[PDB]
Design a protein around this ligand. Sequence first.
Ligand SMILES: Nc1ncnc2c1ncn2[C@@H]1O[C@H](COP(=O)(O)OP(=O)(O)NP(=O)(O)O)[C@@H](O)[C@H]1O
Ligand SMILES: Nc1ncnc2c1ncn2[C@@H]1O[C@H](COP(=O)(O)OP(=O)(O)NP(=O)(O)O)[C@@H](O)[C@H]1O
Ligand SMILES: [Mg+2]
Lengths: 373, 373
Amino acid sequence: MIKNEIKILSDIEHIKKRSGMYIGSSANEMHERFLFGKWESVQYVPGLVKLIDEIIDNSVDEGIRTKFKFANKINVTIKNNQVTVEDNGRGIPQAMVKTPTGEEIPGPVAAWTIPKAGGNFGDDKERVTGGMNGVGSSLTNIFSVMFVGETGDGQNNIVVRCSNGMENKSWETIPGKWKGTRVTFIPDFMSFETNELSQVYLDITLDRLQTLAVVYPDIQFTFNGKKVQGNFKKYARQYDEHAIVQEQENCSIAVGRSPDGFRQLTYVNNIHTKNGGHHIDCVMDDICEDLIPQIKRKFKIDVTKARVKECLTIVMFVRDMKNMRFDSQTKERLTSPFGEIRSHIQLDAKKISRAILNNEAILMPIIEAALAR
Amino acid sequence: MIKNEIKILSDIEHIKKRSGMYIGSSANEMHERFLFGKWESVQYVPGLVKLIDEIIDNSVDEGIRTKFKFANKINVTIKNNQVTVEDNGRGIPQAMVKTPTGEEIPGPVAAWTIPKAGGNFGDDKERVTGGMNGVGSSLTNIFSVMFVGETGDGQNNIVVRCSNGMENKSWETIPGKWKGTRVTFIPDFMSFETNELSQVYLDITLDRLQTLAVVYPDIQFTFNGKKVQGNFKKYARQYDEHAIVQEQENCSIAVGRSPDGFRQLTYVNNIHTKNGGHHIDCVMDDICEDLIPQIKRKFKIDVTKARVKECLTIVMFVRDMKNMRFDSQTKERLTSPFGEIRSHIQLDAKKISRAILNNEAILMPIIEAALAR
Ligand SMILES: Nc1ncnc2c1ncn2[C@@H]1O[C@H](COP(=O)(O)OP(=O)(O)NP(=O)(O)O)[C@@H](O)[C@H]1O
Ligand SMILES: Nc1ncnc2c1ncn2[C@@H]1O[C@H](COP(=O)(O)OP(=O)(O)NP(=O)(O)O)[C@@H](O)[C@H]1O
Ligand SMILES: [Mg+2]
């Protein structure tokens, strides 16, 4: 008989025992991510990419919450299964904060050593950064053999050092004049199903850095000491040379061709909702409510919404969004209410619909495939 | 400027603030789901469905942990925005449990009021239960205006009463002789994007109860006092009359026809991974690696794996699967390693490939579509 004994778990212990809920999958798997604009087959562990992207997203959040004035040179380096992110933001405040137990724990150490502790817990309606869960940076270390974070406020330098899988930790304060953040850690391969950060992880990281540079032209991302140039037109042409691009103040969409199924790549603020959500669905619905009547008047053939939808590879970017509620800790599916997404996103469906109706490189393959079948 | 102040939250407060990662979505969205064998478009909040499925999963988990000797009558009732799940299982042990803070609290109250507490935290390679996180019933009690958990081990009735949305809790013990469990909660709609437990949610719960009675024939689930009859043959024929059925000791498969894209409904133990996972991908690979040479030799045509796959509707049921993990708390993607699932599942793909080849009612549409293009 199975021993049903009700146990009690601590936060660190629960996270280590139940990492699947907090970093997504933890075993190497196959996917079809858009690597550098190519729908190629990729094999990787979502946990490691998620942990790296946690710190990268923290740097991007520091950039965006300061209106890109501070934290605009995010030097991300990944060499020999070691991650090392640098940014020139305001950094962790040195102001004292109080734990529920009453113990006095400073800012950086509380942020980088305990979960459910972050600066994104304020008013949600005005939250613009990509962080909401207050867990995670916590996570690398929490999933790391060594994790040293060096913050500087221009007057003090705070070094938070953790080792033995976050079990050992210590924070120290030194006089200094640095202003920024330098988070460098080494992953723990005992948890994940891997032993080394191969070239594929660096390629995925470079792809997200390129996408973030395209999304945010102000921030100058750097990878392994090499600058990253952010231009949307080249990024969209990397998908298909005949892509149709429409930019707005908060929406930035591009339409390509999907010959072997359905494809997409969407970003909300600085979060890669790679499992879609409601924004892509709402945008595509609005586009189709204009295509279907127009294609009816033009080619006089009845086509369903899904038939047209399955032949487009939409790459779409959203900026300055608020209330980005997700459904997974990995934040892979934007589940914000459709009304809020429609209110914030001001994309003109008629413009893109007319643009792709006027082009023979996209509509004609759809028409030919429908007529042949 | 964005006011950046580090805040620290406990388990309950963080769950209330960040419910997205713990009950999936919280805004009523539209999917295309299998309701009563029909690929019907449905509109609902996944949060409430996950909330009910948590208690139902705990009941089924107790049942299987007793090897169906106990908790074999899971009477589930949903009336007037209220859920009442009763079973005749062993019940929660009265044994005292010591929290990390040192406080002494009973087992039922520890399970039903504070999260990260469960009896499923055994050796992760020996979990035969559909629960792994120790947060489920505590989660459903957090989002409940009222919640009464009445348990009995045959010697004493333990009643845990929670009210005003997790803020009020009170446990009591009375001499008694009842042996079983009864979880009755009324969900709180102030957080969810809904107002009442309308008929769609009852339909979804009844469909899941039918599915559970099909995969688990010993448990006599009764919905609103109405017995649910479980027969896999009729359940499969509900989808498609010409469906091909193959039953094994731990795996049950039913293959049909899909005219409007790809559809699937798969179950591992008692969890509806409605976004697929790694087991169904293994099934597809094993089926295609034998079907493709056969169709190539028969009809002298070349068809890709995706083209054949997308024209099928497969219903798959898996039981007694050990060491299963999920990328989300909602458990909608089984992220166990491919090798472990392949070792556990003893599917014979050659048999189903031969059966589908010998049928001219499902393969012929695929071949006709291939010849059309
Ligand atoms: N480069 C940086 N500059 C300034 N502050 C930083 C930087 N990196 C991290 N932080 C702070 O460190 C904390 C990190 O918490 P973290 O574990 O990443 O959860 P989070 O910030 O809420 N994001 P997420 O978990 O993705 O929702 C945040 O409160 C940030 O304020
Ligand atoms: N109705 C019940 N019958 C039998 N055992 C129960 C019941 N409710 C709770 N338990 C036990 O008490 C714990 C608390 O329930 P719950 O909060 O759902 O934890 P859990 O089962 O680990 N949840 P999850 O991992 O999300 O499926 C469970 O792990 C069981 O050990
Ligand atoms: Mg983030």
